[PDB]
Amino acid sequence: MKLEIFSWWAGDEGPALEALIRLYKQKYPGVEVINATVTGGAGVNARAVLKTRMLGGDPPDTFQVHAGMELIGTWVVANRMEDLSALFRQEGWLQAFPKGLIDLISYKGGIWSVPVNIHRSNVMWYLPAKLKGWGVNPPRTWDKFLATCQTLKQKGLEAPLALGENWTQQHLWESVALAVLGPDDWNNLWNGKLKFTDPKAVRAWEVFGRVLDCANKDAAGLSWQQAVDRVVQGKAAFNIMGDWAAGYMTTTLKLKPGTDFAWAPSPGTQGVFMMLSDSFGLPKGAKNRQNAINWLRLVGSKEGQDTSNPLKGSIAARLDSDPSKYNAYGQSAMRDWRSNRIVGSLVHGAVAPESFMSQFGTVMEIFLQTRNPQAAANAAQAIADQVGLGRL
Ligand SMILES: OC[C@H]1O[C@H](O)[C@H](O)[C@@H](O)[C@@H]1O
């Protein structure tokens, strides 16, 4: 009796998953659970290893996968995933999750994964005590951000923005783009109505370039946790990162939300929640099909999601989640989830296929070397053209 769970929740990202695994082992003491993590922020490495396994005919029993185009445009269109519609009916999930989320996991009459959470991409983290020590406010626009960072450089803070490795630069970029375009034109990139070479979209890269000039010069070789650490250490003022950062700061670092650190929407994005969702499906050919199905039932449940997510920093996908189980960050994100305009993340798989996502890092590499907005814009457009962005 075995169950192999594939994810990128390694190291200090593992607490929430480990909690779910203990829960599963209580309910199913016969099953030896293989925690098959591929170490690497945002699943860049996991994606590559999964590809080797899936194409090799050796699927895991289930794998972490983002709801939306990431899920659909890779293993679903390849006809390698089981349709979960029957299970959704059995569990009452169609009424348990918001319709917008159901839509992301639905394609050609089937439902293809089970959401465990909602993360938000567009969060700016800072230490409200360090900001007072520097006598600045948390910036609500990119102009105020750029002006505040200049003040901080003047006051001796060399790199007021914390930044890490390539994907985290893309992560920053999607917040900047959302701010510059607004939610509708952000959405228009992904349906192909707005070209990346439109002056409106080129400007995303202009604003992004200036933001990049407030960042640490050693960013390329740092993990997302190391970039958060810079803020906690006061070697930076700000970091734009998903709310797994809140999980890191509370679960791992034992910091108190609101007093030891605070949060705001990414500058220029207040009122918009850029979402993503970690989900699990059922691969065809899974060696342990029933055990995996039982894992899906747990991750789709209120008991599972309200055990795991408070540790993670994400909120539950389930509408019936109990807010009393969440700290001050969790409860804030819960509120914004219900009230804000919702758009999806690029970097975390909601809005574009892996064909595009995987090549966006190359685009970002070339912006880092050229710092030419038009070149980057042109590169994103060529990629979109080559993959047929919008066809799914
Ligand atoms: O690795 C950092 C984060 O990246 C991913 O995009 C996941 O959706 C999230 O679960 C994870 O914490």
From TrEMBL:
<feature type="binding site">
    <location>
        <position position="8"/>
    </location>
    <ligand>
        <name>beta-D-galactose</name>
    </ligand>
</feature>
<dbReference type="InterPro" id="IPR006059">
    <property type="entry name" value="SBP"/>
</dbReference>
<keyword id="KW-0732">Signal</keyword>
<dbReference type="Pfam" id="PF01547">
    <property type="entry name" value="SBP_bac_1"/>
</dbReference>
<comment type="function">
    <text>Part of a binding-protein-dependent transport system for a sugar.</text>
</comment>
<feature type="binding site">
    <location>
        <position position="278"/>
    </location>
    <ligand>
        <name>beta-D-galactose</name>
    </ligand>
</feature>
<protein>
    <recommendedName>
        <fullName>Probable sugar-binding periplasmic protein</fullName>
    </recommendedName>
</protein>
<feature type="binding site">
    <location>
        <position position="42"/>
    </location>
    <ligand>
        <name>beta-D-galactose</name>
    </ligand>
</feature>
<feature type="binding site">
    <location>
        <position position="312"/>
    </location>
    <ligand>
        <name>beta-D-galactose</name>
    </ligand>
</feature>
<feature type="binding site">
    <location>
        <position position="13"/>
    </location>
    <ligand>
        <name>beta-D-galactose</name>
    </ligand>
</feature>
<feature type="binding site">
    <location>
        <position position="9"/>
    </location>
    <ligand>
        <name>beta-D-galactose</name>
    </ligand>
</feature>
<dbReference type="InterPro" id="IPR050490">
    <property type="entry name" value="Bact_solute-bd_prot1"/>
</dbReference>
<keyword id="KW-0813">Transport</keyword>
<dbReference type="GO" id="GO:0030313">
    <property type="term" value="C:cell envelope"/>
</dbReference>
<comment type="similarity">
    <text>Belongs to the bacterial solute-binding protein 1 family.</text>
</comment>
